[PDB]
């Protein structure tokens, strides 16, 4: 639907939609920008991620409320949970489709390729949260994406790089919540935290603030898990 709008206007409107907390609009603007076929800048990648994370985050929260009601239990609660589930799956498939056509294959720099592979892992993870039918193949798809991202990140990025940190955080969550691997989750969070800590001395004040924020999330998880 956004084929007639200029790329720059789509990006401008995504920023306006963010300010207005209109995340569905923001996602549609960024989908349109991606479909222009040009690579995305760092800022643009972040706009894409914020938009879809907010959309799917609302869906996931609703799904969890409905699934809890359904667990406690006519066909209505199941029907509605299924409706929300299908809508969530659709959003995940849309994101995965953008990554596959053709953001990942055009991403050569480590910052972009890791970013997109992390996103791929995240959206398969969300699919895994609701899967019951090929749960295993979905889980393996998430794992593979996260693993490729981690292999690049460890080769190409310092241990304090925020995308490297956020990837490791989310892969640890994948292990704990999806793969039933809490020890792997804790290991990963601890090693990531400690290697980042040892590299903080290299950073500026601003970079330090960025890295330590994400480190605190790793710590929050380790506190919950141990």
């Amino acid at each position: 639907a956004m084929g007639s709008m200029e790329r720059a206007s789509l990006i401008q409107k995504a920023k306006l939609a963010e300010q207005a907390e209109r995340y569905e609009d923001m996602a549609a603007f960024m989908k349109g920008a991606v479909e222009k076929g040009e690579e995305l800048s760092c800022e643009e990648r972040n706009l894409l991620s914020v938009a879809y994370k907010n959309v799917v985050g609302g869906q996931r929260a609703a799904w969890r409320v409905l699934s809890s009601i359904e667990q406690k239990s006519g066909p209505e609660v199941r029907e509605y949970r299924e409706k929300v589930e299908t809508e969530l799956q659709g959003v995940c498939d849309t994101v995965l489709g953008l990554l596959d056509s053709h953001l990942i294959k055009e991403a050569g720099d480590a910052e972009s390729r890791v970013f997109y592979l992390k996103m791929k892992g995240d959206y398969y993870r969300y699919l895994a949260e609701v899967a019951t039918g090929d749960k295993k193949r979905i889980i393996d798809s998430a794992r593979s994406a996260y693993q490729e991202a981690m292999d690049i990140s460890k080769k190409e990025m310092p241990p304090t790089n925020p995308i490297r940190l956020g990837l490791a955080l989310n892969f640890s969550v994948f292990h704990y919540e999806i793969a039933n691997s809490p020890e792997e989750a804790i290991s990963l969070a601890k090693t990531t935290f400690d290697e980042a800590m040892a590299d903080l001395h290299t950073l500026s004040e601003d970079s330090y603030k960025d890295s330590t924020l994400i480190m605190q999330l790793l710590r929050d998880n380790l506190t919950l898990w141990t």
């Binding site: 994370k53 995240d122 956020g166 955080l169 989310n170 969550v173 919540e177 999330l217 929050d220 898990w225």
Partner: peptide, 6 residues
């Protein structure tokens, strides 16, 4: 629920 990146 643990924290993923936010």
């Amino acid at each position: 629920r643990p924290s993923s990146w936010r």
